[PDB]
Amino acid sequence: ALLPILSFPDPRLRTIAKPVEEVTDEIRQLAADMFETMYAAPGIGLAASQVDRHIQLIVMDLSESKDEPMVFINPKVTPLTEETQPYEEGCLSVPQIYDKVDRPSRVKIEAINLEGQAFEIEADGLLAVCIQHEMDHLNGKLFVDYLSPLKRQRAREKVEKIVRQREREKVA
Ligand SMILES: [Zn+2]
């Protein structure tokens, strides 16, 4: 029913995504399936790289109510300061692992929406964390890449265990 999410260390998560050529109704349908997948997980961010569609498309909803959806197509993110903020990040492609990352605290976002309109906004807080995390997906990067090798290694061993439990849960 839902789209499968790739899990670390799947090598396809390292693919650099291609620009979206036109917001066609198949990219519209993909965005809608990404939302269902994301909301089911549950998560607040999913990049199209994570469902093995190597395209610059990101869906996001940062709200308690699952009612404030946002789409970023072909995004450009530029920091507006050297000040960073720590945040404990997770990732649906690194399931059930969370750790601290430090990223620029304020950024400018330029992207297009599901109608092909351009927009430009400035983001701090959770938005700035999340858009930078998701942009990293589109350049083949995961948040575990900023951790020490032992923490990455532990994360990898734990995730294979969770994925193996998830499969076993399908047989029951
Ligand atoms: Zn992620």
UniProtKB/TrEMBL annotation:
One of its GO terms (biological process) is translation. One of its GO terms (molecular function) is metal ion binding. Fe cation binds at residues 91, 133, 137. It holds the Pfam family Pep_deformylase. It is an enzyme of class 3 (hydrolase). Its EC number is 3.5.1.88. Its cofactor is Fe(2+). The keyword Protein biosynthesis applies. It catalyses: N-terminal N-formyl-L-methionyl-[peptide] + H2O = N-terminal L-methionyl-[peptide] + formate. The keyword Ribosomal protein does not apply. Keywords: Hydrolase, Iron, Metal-binding, Protein biosynthesis. Binds 1 Fe(2+) ion. The active site is at residue 134. Belongs to the polypeptide deformylase family. HAMAP family: Pep_deformylase. Removes the formyl group from the N-terminal Met of newly synthesized proteins. Requires at least a dipeptide for an efficient rate of reaction. N-terminal L-methionine is a prerequisite for activity but the enzyme has broad specificity at other positions. This is Peptide deformylase. It comes from Acinetobacter baumannii MRSN 3527. The lineage of its organism: Bacteria, Pseudomonadati, Pseudomonadota, Gammaproteobacteria, Moraxellales.
